[PDB]
């Protein structure tokens, strides 16, 4: 965008020691690293570093810079993936963020479920309160983005990261996601879209607002209280699916959701955008439950 990059984030690329890859897309990837003398307190930290692959070209580079500019503009919040620094001089653009010990929320829930079933068939197990905290925290992060007039457009469990103390943060893999081979992204003409997460006005009118994010959050809520099931499971995205969503078809109550939380999901799925709850409403409600 036309936003400026502030060099207050500038970090020496030689002060990074790279480790394993945390995720990889077609033209970008995220790599774990250690930063030496990062931040006000000169900390020595494990961080995440987004960068372009050798396959990337000019457009991919302009996108990575825009993402960096946006993250600066956003500010910092406990429930988003915070920008820690950047390397824009003397080499490829490097974007440095917080490292989240437990990875994405979706995989975490799935592995946790398997580990809990283990004793019967094959750290501590999840309780309902953990799910409420996760949901509450993601809502706080989304409410923060909404207060900045910032539209996420891909709210989902795969884009939520869990850090120390199991605190959920909302992020965006962007170039570091392999959408080309991801079955959660459907080929809708020009682009590949997370259709099962999208609001009807987004699907049909290409309209993205804070409210269409609220819809997608409802789908996320479903993911959490089913412990990481695919939305609309078994249902092929086609003309019938599109028409169904448009006529108010909604998923059934997840196995682990209290009627309370499922009512919240349904509210998020109001066909009329302005009838859906705000992120601050969702936040206040969930905080009390948790
Ligand atoms: C390294 C990096 C660089 C950038 C980002 N970006 C964001 O987190 C983000 C969040 C919100 C926005 C807002 N944006 C507004 C416009 N719309 C269209 C998109 C959203 C942009 C970027 C995250 C990361 N971090 C990241 N990415 C993937 C995986 C991991 C990761 C994995 C495991 C452990 N620790 C970290 N970490």
UniProtKB/Swiss-Prot annotation:
Cytoplasmic topological domain: 1-290
Stated consequence of mutating residue 185 to F: Reduced kinase activity. Reduced interaction with SRC, FYN and YES1
Modified residues (Phosphotyrosine): 185
Record note on what altering residue 151 to N does: In HDLS1; impairs autophosphorylation upon stimulation with CSF1
Outcome (variant: residue 178 to V): Constitutive kinase activity. Loss of inhibition by imatinib
Compartments, record wording: Cell membrane
Domain Protein kinase: from-to ranges: 16-286
Chain segments carrying region Activation loop: 172-194
Effect annotated for changing residue 157 to E: In HDLS1; impairs autophosphorylation upon stimulation with CSF1
Induction: Up-regulated by glucocorticoids.
PTM remark: Autophosphorylated in response to CSF1 or IL34 binding. Ubiquitinated. Becomes rapidly polyubiquitinated after autophosphorylation, leading to its degradation.
Residues where ATP binds: 22-30, 50
Tissue: Expressed in bone marrow and in differentiated blood mononuclear cells.
Active site: 154 (proton acceptor)
Effect of residue 67 to K: In HDLS1; impairs autophosphorylation upon stimulation with CSF1
Impact noted for substituting residue 251 to T: In HDLS1; impairs autophosphorylation upon stimulation with CSF1
Disorder association: Aberrant expression of CSF1 or CSF1R can promote cancer cell proliferation, invasion and formation of metastases. Overexpression of CSF1 or CSF1R is observed in a significant percentage of breast, ovarian, prostate, and endometrial cancers. Aberrant expression of CSF1 or CSF1R may play a role in inflammatory diseases, such as rheumatoid arthritis, glomerulonephritis, atherosclerosis, and allograft rejection.
Entry similarity comment: Belongs to the protein kinase superfamily. Tyr protein kinase family. CSF-1/PDGF receptor subfamily.
Record remark: domains: The juxtamembrane domain functions as autoinhibitory region. Phosphorylation of tyrosine residues in this region leads to a conformation change and activation of the kinase.
Job description of the protein: Tyrosine-protein kinase that acts as a cell-surface receptor for CSF1 and IL34 and plays an essential role in the regulation of survival, proliferation and differentiation of hematopoietic precursor cells, especially mononuclear phagocytes, such as macrophages and monocytes. Promotes the release of pro-inflammatory chemokines in response to IL34 and CSF1, and thereby plays an important role in innate immunity and in inflammatory processes.
Subunit details: Interacts with INPPL1/SHIP2 and THOC5. Monomer. Homodimer. Interacts with CSF1 and IL34. Interaction with dimeric CSF1 or IL34 leads to receptor homodimerization. Interacts (tyrosine phosphorylated) with PLCG2 (via SH2 domain). Interacts (tyrosine phosphorylated) with PIK3R1 (via SH2 domain). Interacts (tyrosine phosphorylated) with FYN, YES1 and SRC (via SH2 domain). Interacts (tyrosine phosphorylated) with CBL, GRB2 and SLA2.
Protein name: Macrophage colony-stimulating factor 1 receptor
Gene: CSF1R
Full protein stretch here: 567 to 914 of 972
């Amino acid at each position: 965008t036309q936003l400026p990059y502030n060099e207050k984030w500038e970090f020496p690329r030689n002060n990074l020691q790279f480790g394993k890859t945390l995720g990889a897309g077609a033209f970008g990837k995220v790599v774990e690293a250690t930063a030496f003398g990062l931040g006000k307190e000169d900390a020595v930290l494990k961080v995440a570093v987004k960068m372009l692959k050798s396959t990337a070209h000019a457009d991919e580079k302009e996108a990575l810079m825009s993402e960096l500019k946006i993250m600066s503009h956003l500010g910092q919040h406990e429930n988003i993936v915070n920008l820690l620094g950047a390397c824009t001089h003397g080499g490829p653009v490097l974007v440095i963020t917080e490292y989240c010990t437990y990875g994405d929320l979706l995989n975490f829930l799935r592995r946790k479920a398997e580990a809990m079933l283990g004793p019967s068939l094959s750290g501590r197990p999840l309780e309902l309160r953990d799910l409420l905290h996760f949901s509450s925290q993601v809502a706080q992060g989304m409410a923060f983005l909404a207060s900045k007039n910032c539209i996420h457009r891909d709210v989902a469990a795969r884009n939520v990261l869990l850090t120390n103390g199991h605190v959920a943060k909302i992020g965006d893999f962007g170039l570091a996601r392999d959408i080309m081979n991801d079955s959660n992204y459907i080929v809708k003409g020009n682009a590949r879209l997370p259709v099962k997460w999208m609001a009807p006005e987004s699907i049909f009118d290409s309209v993205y607002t804070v409210q269409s994010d609220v819809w997608s959050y409802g789908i996320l809520l479903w993911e959490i209280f089913s412990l990481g099931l695919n939305p609309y499971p078994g249902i092929l995205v086609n003309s019938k699916f599109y028409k169904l969503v448009k006529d108010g078809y909604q998923m059934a109550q997840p196995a682990f959701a209290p009627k309370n939380i499922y009512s919240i999901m349904q509210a998020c799925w109001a066909l009329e955008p302005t009838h859906r709850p705000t992120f601050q409403q969702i936040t206040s409600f969930l905080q009390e439950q948790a």
